[PDB]
Design a protein around this nucleic acid. Structure first.
Ligand SMILES: C[C@H]1COc2c(N3CCN(C)CC3)c(F)cc3c(=O)c(C(=O)O)cn1c23
Ligand SMILES: C[C@H]1COc2c(N3CCN(C)CC3)c(F)cc3c(=O)c(C(=O)O)cn1c23
Ligand SMILES: [Mg+2]
Ligand SMILES: [Mg+2]
Ligand SMILES: [Mg+2]
Ligand SMILES: [Mg+2]
Lengths: 247, 487, 487, 245
DNA sequence: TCATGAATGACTATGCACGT
DNA sequence: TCATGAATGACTATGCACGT
């Protein structure tokens, strides 16, 4: 199976890859024009394509279907993925066997992720069931050692760990420049994105798994649905214990 | 590649968004009535010195200073928040003094960042009063380079005064603005009757706060909705504009609208009436003309037909237009990091609690600094009594460390105090200058005693809130705008 | 209502615009090679402390500071100017150190102000070196609130180094960038041969400045255009990219373009070749593939048909694409408020003249301050020699003025010196500190002697330019990028 | 009498008066200035047409391209008259056309671009004295106790300051004299009391004396011939200060 | 279906001179 | 016709909850 990539009927903002093999191809769905721009530069153009999303995605759980299909950002995703939606879905027409969602580490990136996962689960569920959907974990810190190569950290803990280890090893950091803190993908350049989220030999990806379909169906409808009361009581009930989900 | 279940991801991710929005974006803190963007803009302008005792700074500088130190978001939306705080039709008591084109109550958008200048208003200066005296908790900013305030001193009840509206997740707030003088009376009562229970307090505060006071004036019809909002935290308050019937030389009648209810777009209002005649559901109207100007204010002239009754057409406008519209009150605010729907007595009480906290903390800060200052002065006085020796002692010392170490031993003094003796100028060795040091010690010891007396007497603490707030209201308090009538 | 003739209005209005654009917008000052917006951005960042010894500040803060104090224009276009100065493919020696997405040589636009941070580069620090020592004239800003520099010290020949392109009215400039090390040699010669006439100087400078050195590397073909530009002020310099023919195991040969001439958009270049094939104007080409990446740089692979000669296809690319394109040199710059087309010897000479002025002015400032510091120290030494007395007099004084007036009588002292004695701390009455005051006087009188020697000898002055510039080149100078070949 | 919109440009803020003889069109530089002007105007007789960006040079650009320009179409449509041979003074919807631009050089430039459009496409508007130029203020003197004064030149500023101080009035050295760098920096009230209030506004009526002499000057300054323009500036820029001496 | 307001920027058109 | 580079910002779409 092989499909043609655009080179001078696909979304205008899509920076397609060169490889015509979906099994080896990857679509990075990126939050923001800035981050998408740097991703387009730092990527491996052979296997990696970039689809920058602009603004918060439409909630397909709340909005009527006709309005969802009128949304330009949804059309871009559906067109780029090549598969249909709902009953007309066909995995054989999938243009990328890896769909990486890359959003800011901040709170709005988390929101956009739920909006995208809602789109995928409702319109193109088999992509999730067959492990084609991934989540890129962006860095939070860049430790700029004076003489050594810079290190990236993906959590406050790792930052503290790499700092102590380096100092214990005799390395040194400026207390001015020091540890750069990333507040979003848009703040990174092309090189930084490659060496943290796009280089397949270093990137930290999470594969979205779907266990209980019925339980997921209910969670999606509570959180993303039109019923506010149901959503309000769920948050006040479970927000108190978000920290302890993995303990 | 690590595996993650979609249910775990969706739940963790959406709750993190919901909670941060609730606590950290859309809803006001009960103590100062500010959302994070408001608090960060105002403090940025404050720290930058963009104050009413200096010319308006370019508003771009305020946005950029906010962006670079406190609010890790976009210049565009931050400017929008700043602009709102400068519009007299949005805030009952504007916190930003805008210079230039900041838009209109209609569809005329504000000028771009580059065209406008801005500074804090005198009342906003009361929001930040003595913020530098440890009156509020400070936390590191978004990258730990600098500190930002968790809440402002807020020396006037800003939440109730300017109100607040915000859409969060799972909930939303909609608090109307109020008249400062009425709120002050409520606060004055709460301070006097500090032991009164919630039942008595609510009765007293409701008697003094007659209802919301909108910047756009207009009318409030009925008393039930207001009462509901103060007793429940939710109520539907009926608003109305002002209509004055005019007669013509021919003998034609026309309706003149000079006021509209809160948050009604002037242009959308005129367009709605125009479209409702087109189809024709507002018969009796002959002509619609906007005779508004910067000099006469709002003036929408509605000429009616000869076979039309003025009140009939007015009643139709009340029904089919926002000439009469209701304010859906929902008294939701963040209390100690938790969203809570509050009664009016709770809103006042929580604010009073904040003012008492502020003044105790200020008194503590001033008391600590006074003791440090007195401590050093005591050391100087010891040096003056043995001045003949102290000078000789320093001179015969090969270094300043040898001189310092000696001063501790010679006068039985701390190292901090001894450092101050070294730091002393030859100026203060003059006769009158030696005397100033003596008197200054006596001056402070009187201040320390006073400050200690304040901390020991809850009565004085409450008295300071009252007296200081009274000054603010006498200076910045204004007349009621929204007229309250019955059914 | 006053009447005005259309010819009077048109002439006055258009000339005022033309002149301001010519002198005050589009064209570079010959001394520092900067347009007003550049100079104002850089000074704004400098004054704000956005220097290499501190972290990158949010670029919004730089724009706002420029906008609010120096450059009365829009945030959008000012940001565009700041961004350009940070791109290594635009400026041969970047003046802004950008952090984040500042675009690419192709059609990838820079990130918005929001996402990027910026500070001055070490070389930009040389542009502003000792600007606070009255090395350049300052004038009031656009509203007389603050002062701004008319020109920067520019301690390296920035106009020739980074070049300049600008469209004005009735004229335009287009100066290419040059290799700093080569420019320094030219300057070193001009300083040594300061009496040489234009005939000799032009010959010497042209021998040392071998030609333009573009940040995008590439090739320069021929020598006529370069020579014309330096002797006439106008010339057409032929540029070329770099092409490497590779052979595969299949027998297919392909052309690999790894460099392009100055100011050629990578994406427009690929599109041009692709569209020329579609219609069919570059036969012999089989396939176009962009194998470029952040790690290998530019790499455009052009596979050609087997019945095609590589050299034929390359010549076809030279003719019908910007793989070969000419740089239209027009050495136009503002000299003393007047636009002038300059020979290469005039450009160097004018820069050298500026450097000599800077150092004479710096020396004058340092001499004045040295005399002031020495003047006060002389008073201090007098106090130390009669220290026992100095204390007694101050003690008996009712005021400090009584103490001051006496110090004048006792030691025969100015009012400034006596005041300095008064402001003296007991810190400095220690042994080593008293000795420090003595030695410090001796140090300045040695510095004053040195400084006076500089002003009296033009030889040393030229020596300072040479030696200081030499340090700059050794630290920040780099290899040539553009290779110069013959026909 | 002609109908006012309540088939014309969307950005046109038309007046209420249906009489062109009584009507005025303020052609304003920038959305900001146009926005505040729309508020400070007298909606009865004054209409506002905000222009966005540099106007296209009709002297350089071909005719068809000019007619595609949205900013030109707005002007032609709003004025009601035709253009060139199809021009008709009878359809003029405003007998007063006030060009209001910033006091800066780009405002001066936009004026020359507008005057070029008018002179080439709708010349009779100039010949019959329907084209005016509003002179914006440059300074606002903010007295501590007295009403604020506006100045239209550096000289007037110095004069009003001197008179006021001599009369015993006082100003802050912080707030002090606000300096306008463009119409966009002004609010509705300030624009009314300086450029739109008919009892205080400073208008200049554009007159056309020698049509032939004007025709060549327009072609030199605005035409495609750079050399002719370059030499004209270097020849006459030396003496612009002395045009009215 | 529209308003609220604090969050997630690219695109659009001209002046100006010069060379393709 | 297009690129250059400083000059002169409005419009476009979603989330979120609630009331007409
Ligand atoms: C998130 C960025 C980019 O996307 C945006 C919009 N688009 C959404 C996607 N497209 C359907 C076209 C419209 C938009 F209409 C407005 C804004 C906006 O106001 C804005 C700001 O900072 O204030 C920032 N953005 C916006
Ligand atoms: C003058 C303002 C308003 O008009 C502008 C544009 N057009 C908008 C649609 N019109 C049909 C013609 C003009 C434009 F394409 C770009 C800009 C722009 O970049 C800008 C800036 O400060 O950077 C400021 N402006 C622009
Ligand atoms: Mg983000
Ligand atoms: Mg926005
Ligand atoms: Mg622009
Ligand atoms: Mg202007």
């Amino acid at each position: 199976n092989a499909l043609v990539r655009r080179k001078s009927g696909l979304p205008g903002k899509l920076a397609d890859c060169r490889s015509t093999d979906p099994r080896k191809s990857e679509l990075y769905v990126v939050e923001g024009d800035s981050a998408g721009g740097s991703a387009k530069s730092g990527r491996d153009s052979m296997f990696q394509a970039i689809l920058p999303l602009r603004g918060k995605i439409i909630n397909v759980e709340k909005a009527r279907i006709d309005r969802v299909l009128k949304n330009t950002e949804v059309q871009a995703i559906i067109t780029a993925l090549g598969t249909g939606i709902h009953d007309e879905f066909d995995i054989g027409k999938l243009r990328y066997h890896k769909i990486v969602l890359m959003a800011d580490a901040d709170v709005d990136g988390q929101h956009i992720s739920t909006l995208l996962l809602t789109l995928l689960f409702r319109f193109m569920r088999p992509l999730i069931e067959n492990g084609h959907v991934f989540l890129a974990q962006p860095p939070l810190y860049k430790l700029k050692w004076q003489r050594s190569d810079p290190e990236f950290a993906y959590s406050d803990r790792e930052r503290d760990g790499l700092l102590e280890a380096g100092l214990k090893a005799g390395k040194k950091i400026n207390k001015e420049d020091g540890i750069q803190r990333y507040k979003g993908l848009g703040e990174m350049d092309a090189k930084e994105l490659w060496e943290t989220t796009m280089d397949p030999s270093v990137r930290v990806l999470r594969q979205v798994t779907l266990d209980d379909a019925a339980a997921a169906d209910e969670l999606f409808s509570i959180l993303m649905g039109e019923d506010v009361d149901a959503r309000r009581s769920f948050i006040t009930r479970n927000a108190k214990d978000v920290r302890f989900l993995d303990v | 590649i690590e595996p993650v279940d979609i249910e775990q991801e969706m739940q963790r991710s959406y709750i993190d968004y919901a909670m941060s929005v609730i606590v950290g974006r859309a809803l006001p803190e009960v103590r100062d009535g500010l959302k994070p963007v408001h608090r960060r803009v105002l403090y940025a302008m404050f720290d930058s010195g963009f104050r009413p005792d200096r010319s308006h700074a370019k508003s771009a500088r305020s946005v950029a200073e906010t962006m670079g130190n406190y609010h890790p978001h976009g210049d565009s939306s931050i400017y929008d928040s700043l602009v709102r705080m400068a519009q007299p039709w949005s805030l009952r008591y504007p916190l930003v003094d805008g210079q230039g084109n900041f838009g209109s109550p209609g569809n005329d958008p504000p000028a771009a960042m580059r065209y406008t200048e801005a500074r804090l208003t005198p009342l906003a200066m009361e929001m930040l009063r003595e913020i530098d005296e440890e009156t509020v908790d400070f936390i590191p900013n978004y990258d730990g380079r600098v500190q930002e305030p968790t809440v402002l001193p807020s020396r006037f009840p800003n939440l109730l005064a300017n109100g607040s509206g915000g859409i969060a997740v799972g909930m939303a707030t909609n608090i109307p603005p109020h008249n400062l003088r009425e709120l002050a009376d409520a606060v004055f009562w709460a301070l006097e009757n500090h032991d009164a229970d919630e039942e008595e307090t609510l009765a007293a505060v409701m008697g003094r706060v007659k209802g919301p006071d909108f910047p756009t004036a207009g009318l409030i019809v009925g008393s039930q909705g207001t009462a509901d909002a103060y007793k429940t935290g939710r109520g539907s308050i009926r608003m109305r504009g002002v209509v004055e019937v005019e007669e013509d030389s021919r003998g034609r009648t026309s309706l003149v609208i000079t006021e509209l209810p809160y948050q009604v777009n002037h242009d959308n209002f005129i367009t709605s009436i125009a479209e409702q005649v087109r189809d024709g559901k507002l018969a009796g109207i002959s002509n619609i003309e906007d005779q508004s100007s910067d000099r006469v204010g709002l003036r929408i002239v509605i000429e009616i037909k000869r076979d039309a009754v003025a009140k009939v057409v007015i009643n139709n406008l009340y029904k089919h237009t926002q000439l009469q519209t209701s304010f859906g009150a929902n008294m939701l605010a963040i209390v100690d990091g938790v969203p809570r729907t509050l009664r009016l007595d709770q809103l006042i009480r929580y604010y009073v609690d904040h003012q008492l906290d502020v003044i105790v903390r200020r008194t503590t800060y001033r008391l600590r600094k006074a003791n440090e200052r007195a401590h050093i002065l005591r050391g100087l006085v010891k040096a003056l009594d043995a001045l003949d020796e102290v000078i000789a002692l320093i001179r015969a010392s090969e270094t300043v460390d040898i001189a310092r170490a000696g001063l501790i031993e010679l006068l039985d003094i701390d190292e901090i105090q001894a450092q101050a003796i070294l730091d002393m100028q030859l100026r203060r060795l003059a006769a009158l200058e030696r005397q100033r040091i003596i008197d200054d010690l006596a001056k402070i010891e009187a201040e320390i005693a006073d400050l200690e007396d304040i901390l020991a007497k809850p009565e004085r603490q409450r008295g300071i809130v009252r007296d200081e707030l009274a000054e603010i209201v006498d200076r910045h308090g204004d007349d009621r705008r929204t007229r309250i009538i019955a059914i």
